[PDB]
Amino acid sequence: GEIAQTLKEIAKTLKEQAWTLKEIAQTLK
Amino acid sequence: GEIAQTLKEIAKTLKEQAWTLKEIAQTLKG
Amino acid sequence: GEIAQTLKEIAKTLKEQAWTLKEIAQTLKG
Amino acid sequence: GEIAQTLKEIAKTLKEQAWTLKEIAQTLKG
Amino acid sequence: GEIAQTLKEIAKTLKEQAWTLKEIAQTLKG
Amino acid sequence: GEIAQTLKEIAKTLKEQAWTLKEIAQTLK
């Protein structure tokens, strides 16, 4: 349903954010 | 329902945050 | 109910965070 | 119930994080 | 069940993240 | 369910993000 699809979008976005934070961490290091 | 709509709003907001973080990462890099 | 209200609070807080991240992005540019 | 209480904890923590991010934004700016 | 347990894990992790953000804020300040 | 599995993925991703934030904190320190 809509809820399952929306949660999957949230999961995908958080994974993208996690990768971006890793980029930031690497840049700072 | 209200909960489904609110979760969609959360999803949209998180996507906005993700984009902003990408901008920050790019700015820091160069 | 309580769950829907709590999710709305989460949504509002994430929107606040999103705005703050935009401020940070702007500051880092100069 | 347990889910509602856990979501409330999440909401409170996100609000704390939002305040801390504002502190970071302010520090970076000046 | 699984949902409640998973949300508790999320709550714990977010609390850890909140503390780490406070560390970042403190480092930037001083 | 799909919801429970998606939340587990979210939990794992947030843990990764938490570790990355710690890396950022350490770099700044």
Residue F8's closest CA among A28, D15, A14? A14
Give D16→chain C minimum CA distance, Å: 9
Q: Which of residues 3-22 of E touch F (CB under 8 A)?
A: 3, 6-7, 9-10, 13-14, 16-17, 20-21
**b/e for C5-23, b at 16 or more Cβ within 10 A?**
ebbbbbbbbbbbbbbbbbb
CA C19 – CA D18 distance, rounded (Å)? 10
H runs (alpha helix) in chain F: 2-28
F-chain residues within 8 Å CB-CB of A3?
3
**What is the Cα Rg of chain C in Å?**
13
CB A21 within 8 A of CB F23: no
- State both tokens at D15: 């609000």
Resolution limit, Å? 1.5
Method of structure determination: X-ray
The C-alpha atoms of residue E26 and residue F9 are separated, in whole angstroms, by: 31
- Maximum pairwise Cα distance, chain C: 44
E25 to chain D, any CB pair closer than 8 A? The answer is: yes
Q: CB of A13 within 8 A of CB of B14?
A: yes
